Design a protein around this ligand. Structure first.
Ligand code: GTP
Ligand code: G1I
Lengths: 278, 230, 331, 52
């Protein structure tokens, strides 16, 4: 398990640093759309740098040795990094929606100052739902096992209430999911309409691409993050049905998603030539 | 010494403040290039050195360019217009018999030259086929075959849109003339740009809505192709 | 009858200059040691233009320069401290050339409107508009503070009087569009390169052509004198640069490579004339050895094609412009 | 314009031109003499370089 865990860490760090250094080094990639990609890359880079190694050490050693404060700090960083990464994909989807559906007003709608304001707002909302309710002990479970876990010095596990497990899950996953679905359905409709318009005019002289692209984009994200955010609600609604091993496995499957974003959002020819130059 | 540097920075900041204001106007305006082939009626189209016109529809600013000061068969200056939204081409479809190499073949050659250009490799063309009424008049009057031999084996397309009360001869004539341009357009196209042909007359009044819709389609297709959805 | 004598006259000219070719330039300069590798790095990057850049001209003081762009602006920079000094909006957005007066009090401009406009920098407003050309302007250079020579796309060049706005003399003889011109150090002769693959030598005072050079085979895009004043270099869109000698009435050497197939947009010499800097359509510039015809350096820091180039009078820096709305200083 | 073209050829053809060796020698001598003060050929020290 040590070999696989080490390889995952290297893949996340190596891919994200390459994307960040490519945008900053070259002046042709300074685009409003690329700022969201930069924010997402920073989020996944921080995730891979901080969250994964300590979780791997905790799993392998079967104990926590850094204390009762660093455990809470690690949990807060985990929630902050997970929430902020998912919410940027929503911004990217909305950006593409505005670009395609309203082409004449796209330049006026999006400005660099507006992009900076949106990114700062997303990061602030992400930080307001992770550090604040955790460091203030507003999420702690009340049963005896949770009390013993909190009192123990070498034990660092996750126990939460109904309210937090509902609110954090909703904010982190459920609203962005429906927003992305609504955006991408209309994007697909517009693409199909334009494809149908092209054929009547010059059809005799001569929707797989859009379907494949949207399928990849939605499928990777859903298949990576849906089971964990289902069991998160389920294991709190009904007790003694999900073992901790299933919870950890699904959480790690979700963590793996951070290493796929460069392969999905950085396949443009400009990015390819930038990588070749480096 | 110390005061000179401060004075320089004061003027630079004022200049850069105005440059930001002009960038909003430049990015929100669409540039069009108007082309023609001799006597084709392009002046009537714009009625209803270089000459520039300004018009606005649905709160969108369009700015059209017509070149008349330079008359030559080698358009060395055409590489300047490689960032325009679209090119408007006006051709008189009723000048197949007129020789003053007839005019229609020369217009087709000009269109072929413009389409296969190194600089205009990502620019779409809006095609206006002017002078339809007198075309129909002379077609009804007692021959395209005498000038275009390929017309002897042409049939009207099944997926056509004949006008109400139209003799099936004039419809075949218009569709043949349009397909002459369409085959050249589709021969060497890789999806980077398309062509939008329209049938136009003198009494037409909806020639600006067509340009608006064609530009909207151009931009939307550009974005769709950019995002790998097309 | 008349055409028969033209062929006979053109025949003796080829034979007259065939006997004068005792030896080649390369044959004399085999013993010269090579200049070696030359490396240059960007020192400044000037930003602020909203569209592609077509023209650029250095100042006589080697401190300020002017540039033109398609958005309709004429910005004067400060290459040392990187501070914008002026920003002149243009009536017509299509501009193809600009010039800077030797005294530094005026700046010229022109383009697709067939009009040359002179601006007053020390007063900024339009001071004079020159009309009479029937084609787009391609270049313009200041002879003095009151007279200026221009070339246009109507196959003619003219010498103007700024005070009265009237053409003093007109130069005719080309067949295609004239693309560029350059003035001699003494301001008494000038050369022009047109689209009929020919270059001519004119007399400003008299007004008649002296010699014709026809070594190219494609549209000539740029031209520049040797610093001495007895030679010049041209550049066409067939990836070739050629050196011509006035006293020998023939070309001396060509600069080409098998890995270059793009066109050439601009040429310029160095302070001593040893180096020849030429811009290309393949997004970067090249540096040649004038007496050897071998490459010595490459300037490859632009995103789109280079459209203009210039060298300071003292020979301290090189400025290049391109279609990505950027200017760069190389030292 | 038939007569004008022939007249220009006659005027242009009657000039005295020197051999290529002299012109090449003159160019080489000028370059060798003025190559000392060429900042682009030999980089100048950063103390006397206004752009660095
Ligand atoms: N019946 C009919 N006549 C037209 C039409 N368009 C132009 N004409 C006639 O053709 C003449 C030319 O019109 P202009 O608007 O000046 O067009 P043009 O001079 O050919 O344009 P250019 O040659 O490119 O400068 C007009 O006087 C009209 O009488 C048309 O659509 N239908
Ligand atoms: C211990 N791992 C945590 C547990 C709960 C949780 C995560 C991520 C985002 C959320 O909104 C959450 O509520 C997981 O990373």
């Amino acid at each position: 398990m040590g070999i696989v865990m080490s390889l995952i860490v290297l893949a996340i760090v190596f891919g994200n640093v390459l994307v960040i250094t490519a945008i900053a080094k070259f002046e042709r990639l300074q685009t409003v759309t690329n700022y969201f990609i930069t924010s997402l890359a920073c989020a996944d880079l921080v995730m891979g740098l901080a969250v994964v190694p300590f979780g791997a050490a905790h799993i392998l050693t079967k104990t926590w040795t850094f204390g009762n404060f660093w455990c809470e700090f690690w949990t807060s960083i985990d929630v902050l990094c997970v929430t902020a990464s998912i919410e940027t994909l929503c911004v990217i989807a909305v950006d593409r929606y505005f670009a395609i559906t309203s082409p004449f007003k796209y330049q006026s709608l999006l400005t660099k100052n507006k992009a900076r304001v949106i990114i700062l707002m997303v990061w602030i909302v992400s930080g307001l739902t992770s550090f604040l309710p955790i460091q203030m002990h507003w999420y702690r479970a009340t049963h005896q096992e949770a009390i013993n876990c909190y009192a123990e010095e070498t034990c660092c596990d996750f126990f939460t209430n109904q309210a937090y497990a509902i609110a954090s899950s909703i904010v982190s996953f459920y609203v962005p999911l429906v927003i992305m679905v609504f955006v991408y359905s209309r994007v697909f409709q517009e693409a199909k309409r334009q494809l149908q318009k092209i054929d009547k005019s010059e059809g005799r002289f001569h929707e797989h691409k859009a379907l494949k692209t949207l399928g990849i984009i939605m499928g990777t994200f859903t298949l990576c993050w849906l089971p964990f955010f289902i069991v998160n609600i389920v294991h709190v609604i009904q007790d003694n049905l999900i073992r901790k091993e299933v919870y950890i496995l699904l959480n790690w499957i979700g963590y793996v998603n951070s290493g796929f974003n460069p392969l999905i959002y950085c396949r443009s020819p400009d990015f390819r030539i930038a990588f070749q130059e480096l | 010494q110390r005061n000179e540097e401060k004075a320089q920075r004061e003027a630079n900041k004022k200049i850069e403040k105005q440059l930001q204001k002009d960038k909003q106007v430049y990015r929100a305006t669409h540039r069009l290039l108007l082309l023609g082939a001799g006597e084709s009626g392009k002046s009537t189209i714009v009625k209803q050195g270089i000459f520039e016109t300004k018009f606005q529809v649905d709160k969108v600013n369009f700015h059209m360019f017509d070149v008349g000061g330079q008359r030559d068969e080698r358009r060395k200056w055409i590489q300047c217009f490689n960032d325009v939204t679209a090119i408007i081409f006006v051709v008189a479809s009723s000048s197949y018999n007129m020789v003053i190499t007839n005019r229609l073949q020369e217009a087709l050659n000009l269109f072929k030259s413009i389409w296969n250009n190194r600089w205009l490799r990502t620019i779409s063309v809006i095609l206006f086929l002017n002078k339809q009424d007198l075309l129909a008049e002379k077609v009804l009057a007692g021959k395209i075959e005498d000038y275009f031999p390929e017309f002897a084996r042409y049939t009207t397309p099944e997926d056509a849109t004949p006008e109400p009360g139209e003799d099936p001869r004039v419809t075949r004539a218009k569709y043949f003339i349009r397909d002459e341009f369409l085959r050249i357009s589709t021969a060497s196209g890789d999806g980077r740009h398309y062509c939008y042909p329209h049938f136009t007359c003198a009494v037409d009044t909806e020639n600006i809505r067509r340009v608006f819709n064609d530009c909207r389609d151009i931009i939307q297709r550009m974005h769709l192709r950019q995002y790998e959805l097309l | 009858q008349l055409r028969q004598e033209a062929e006979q006259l053109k025949n003796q000219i080829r034979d007259a200059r065939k006997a004068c070719a005792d030896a080649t330039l390369s044959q004399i300069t085999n013993n010269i040691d090579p200049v070696g590798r030359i490396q240059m790095r960007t020192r400044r990057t000037l930003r602020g233009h909203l569209a592609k850049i077509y023209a650029m001209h250095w100042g006589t003081d080697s401190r300020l320069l002017v540039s033109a762009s398609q958005d309709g602006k004429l910005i004067i920079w400060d290459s040392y401290t990187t501070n914008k000094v002026h920003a002149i909006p243009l009536r017509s957005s299509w501009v193809m050339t600009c010039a800077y007066a030797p005294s530094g009090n005026y700046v010229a401009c022109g383009g697709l409107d067939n009009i040359c406009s002179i601006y007053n920098l020390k007063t900024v407003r339009v001071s004079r508009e020159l009309a009479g050309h029937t084609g787009y302007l391609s270049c313009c250079r200041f002879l003095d503070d009151n007279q200026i020579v221009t070339s246009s796309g109507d196959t003619t060049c003219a010498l103007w009087d700024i005070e009265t706005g009237q053409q003093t003399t007109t130069f005719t003889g080309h067949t295609g569009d004239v693309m560029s011109l350059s003035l001699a150090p003494d301001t008494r002769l000038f050369v022009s390169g047109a689209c009929d693959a020919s270059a001519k030598l004119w007399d400003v005072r008299e007004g008649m052509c002296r010699q014709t050079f026809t070594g190219h085979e494609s549209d000539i895009n740029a031209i520049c004198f040797f610093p001495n004043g007895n030679a010049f270099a041209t550049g066409s869109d067939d990836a070739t640069c050629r050196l011509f000698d006035l006293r020998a009435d023939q070309e001396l050497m060509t600069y080409s490579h098998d890995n270059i197939i793009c066109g050439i947009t601009s040429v310029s010499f160095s302070k001593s004339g040893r180096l020849l800097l030429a811009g290309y359509d393949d997004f970067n510039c090249n540096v040649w050895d004038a007496l050897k015809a071998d490459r010595a350096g490459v300037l490859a820091g632009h995103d789109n094609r280079v459209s203009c180039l210039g060298v300071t009078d003292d020979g301290m820096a090189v400025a290049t412009g391109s279609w990505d709305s950027f200017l760069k200083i190389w030292n | 314009q038939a007569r004008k073209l022939v007249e220009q050829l006659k005027m242009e053809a009657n000039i005295d031109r020197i051999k290529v060796s002299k012109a090449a020698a003159d160019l080489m001598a000028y370059c060798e003499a003025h190559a000392k003060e060429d900042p682009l050929l030999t980089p100048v020290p950063a103390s006397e370089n206004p752009f660095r």
